[PDB]
Structure formats: C-alpha cells, structure tokens
C-alpha cells in the first residue's frame, strides 16, 4: 500500500516513532479500505438472497 | 529570560514557569539576534492573537553543533541522555551564539553534559545524579576503575575554536494551549460586548 | 483522524495557509469517508424498504 | 526537453545569511518587506 | 593477530585482512590487560 513493508514488526523494528507513523497510517488505510468492500458486497448479496 | 548574564549547563536546565502577564511576541520575532526561531505547533505570525494557560521557558547553554538536535523526533547524544522534547511539542526554539558573551580562551569548563547514561531519559526530564557509569561488564564500585567512568564531560569552549564549537544559548517555550481559562496573551482593546 | 484538532476554526487561527492545507486535506477526506458509507447503508435500506 | 513562453530572472545581491528566505513559504524581514515569492512558484533559484 | 610471537615495527607495520567467519568483541573487550581500548566509529557495546 505504498508503505515500506506489509510486515508491521519489521516497519517498527527499523523504522522510529518520529515517522513510522507515516506508514502505518498507509496500511491502516489500506486494510480499512477492504473491510468497506468486503462488507458492501456482503450486505448486496445478503439482500439478494 | 533572555539578557541573563549567564545560563546552566544542558542537564541542569533552568525551567521558568511565567504567568499572569501581557506578551508581545511580535518584538520577539522582530529581533535579528536570535539566529534560529522556528515553532512547530503554532505559526509565528498568528502568535500575536494566541491566549496560553501558562508558558515555560527552559534555557541552557550548548555547543551549537547540537542545535540540529533540538527539533522533536530527533535523536542523539544530547537529545537521548540529558534533553528531551515530545513528539506532540505546541511551542518554540531559540537559539543564538554567544561567542562574545562567555566564550574564555581560559576555557570554560564550568559547562558540563551527561555523556553517559543507562537508559534514555523521560520527555521533560531533568537528571542530576553523578554517580559513575560501569562501560564493560566489570562492575565497578568507589569512584575510578578500569572501563568505569563519570558520565559527566565538559566542552572545550574558547572563542578561538571553530564554527558550532562557540557556545550557543538556547530557549525553548513550551506553552500549553486551549484547555483551561487562558492567562498570558494579548496586546489586543476588547471592543464591546 | 491525524490532525491537530477536530475544529476548523482554531486550526486556522493557529496556522497559516501552507500547513493548514496538510491538516485539513486529510480531515476533508476523513469526513467524505463517512458520508459515503452512510448513503451507502440508506441505498441498500431505500432498496429493502 | 521543455518549452516555455516567457522567462523572467531576476538578480540581486544579499546577505549570506539570508539565502534560506528566498524559499516560498519562509519568513524573515527580507521575504516579509522587500522580496516577496509567491507560494505556487515555479522556476529556480541560484546563489553564490 | 593478537598472541602472535612476535610483530614488525611501526615503518612495516603487519596488515592482516580477516573475513568470513565469527568474532566475538566481548572477550577482547573485558580483558583489561590491554594498555588502551579506543574505538572510534562504533561504540564498544554496539560492537556484538
């Protein structure tokens, strides 16, 4: 998601607190991003069903 | 605060904590004899129009090769032993040389720093103690022994030394911002009501 | 969501524009994430209805 | 590999101190009183 | 490289080039009979 690893120890175990925050809010968003599809889809095909 | 004749080493920093009193940044900023004024929360030209809680300024006198150290979310020497400041810092840093003002070609040893530490320090932490810290796995006891050393070390200042190595007198303002009944602002007529 | 408060109004009478545009970039699309999962669920409830 | 319409230098001279005012978006007496950039500049900037 | 018989002197001082296997600082570290231990660019714990 464009942040340096997807690996979350390995961003915290090289990068510090003054910009590991830049990346993992990537990742956070990124991971958020796919909980909204999942669930849409889910709440379509419930609906269809 | 600031034409004080002289300031305290780096770990035995001299906090004041002023309140209940009218500022005017604006002639502070309009000084040329601060070589580095650069705030992190606020941005200067508005701090005319800024009411603090009460406001802290902590000075001390350093090496001015250390003055990249100050910022926030830095590291090193200074800023893991004896200095540090908070990642979520809402104020200021000021820095000038004061070469002509306490640099001796005598040499002024009167300015120590922590070299030494077992573990970096607190945010707004001030440290005191002097006890000798054990550098190999030789414990150590007394006051001298091999590879068992004081954590206290003092510059080298005279003015005859190169760029940086003058001494540099530092404050930092470390106001706290919109969550109580505001003290210290304002140069500003309330109009009425 | 990141930045230094939830208010408009302190953050721009605290900062000048350079940096208040970082600010309040990233609140403006936090506040459009939510109003697009809330029309969202009302399109698929408008649909159950 | 560009093109451009027009291009506009402009010269003077300052103290050396006072190279870090010339960027957009910096503040000090020289950028706040005599020379002012705008924020959206496009170009480059050269001293010596 | 340290308990050889002997050594050359100071104008052909001996270069000896070790890689490729395991060194352990700890134990050349805490033997105090050495005269001095002064290293430069690494601080002597963050040498194992």
New interface residues.
């Given amino acids: 998601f464009g942040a340096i690893s997807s690996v979350l120890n390995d961003i915290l175990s090289r990068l510090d607190p003054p910009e590991a925050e830049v990346q993992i809010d990537r990742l956070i968003t990124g991971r958020l991003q796919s909980l909204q599809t999942y669930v849409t889809q889910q709440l379509i095909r419930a609906a269809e069903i | 605060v600031f034409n004080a004749t002289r300031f305290a080493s780096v770990y035995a920093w001299n906090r004041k904590r002023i309140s209940n009193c009218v500022a005017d940044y604006s002639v502070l900023y ?1 000084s ?1 004899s601060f070589s580095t004024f650069k705030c992190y ?6 701090l005319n ?2 009411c603090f809680t009460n406001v802290y300024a902590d000075s001390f006198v350093i090496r001015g090769d250390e003055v990249r150290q100050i910022a ?4 090193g020497k200074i800023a893991d032993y004896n200095y540090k400041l908070p ?1 979520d810092f809402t104020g200021c840093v000021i820095a000038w040389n004061s070469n002509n003002l306490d640099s001796k070609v005598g040499g002024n040893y009167n300015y120590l720093y922590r070299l030494f530490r077992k573990s970096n320090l607190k945010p707004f932490e001030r440290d005191i103690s002097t006890e000798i810290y054990q ?4 414990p150590c006891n007394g006051v001298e022994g ?2 068992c050393y004081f954590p206290l070390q003092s510059y080298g200042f005279q003015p005859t030394n190169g760029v940086g190595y003058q001494p540099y007198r530092v404050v930092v303002l470390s106001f706290e911002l ?1 969550h109580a009944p505001a003290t210290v602002c304002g140069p500003k007529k309330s109009t009425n009501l």
Same sequence: chains 1, 3.
């Fill in positions: 309009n040329a929360g606020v941005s200067p030209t508005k129009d800024l926030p979310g830095q590291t990642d550098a190999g796995s030789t091999f590879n919109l």
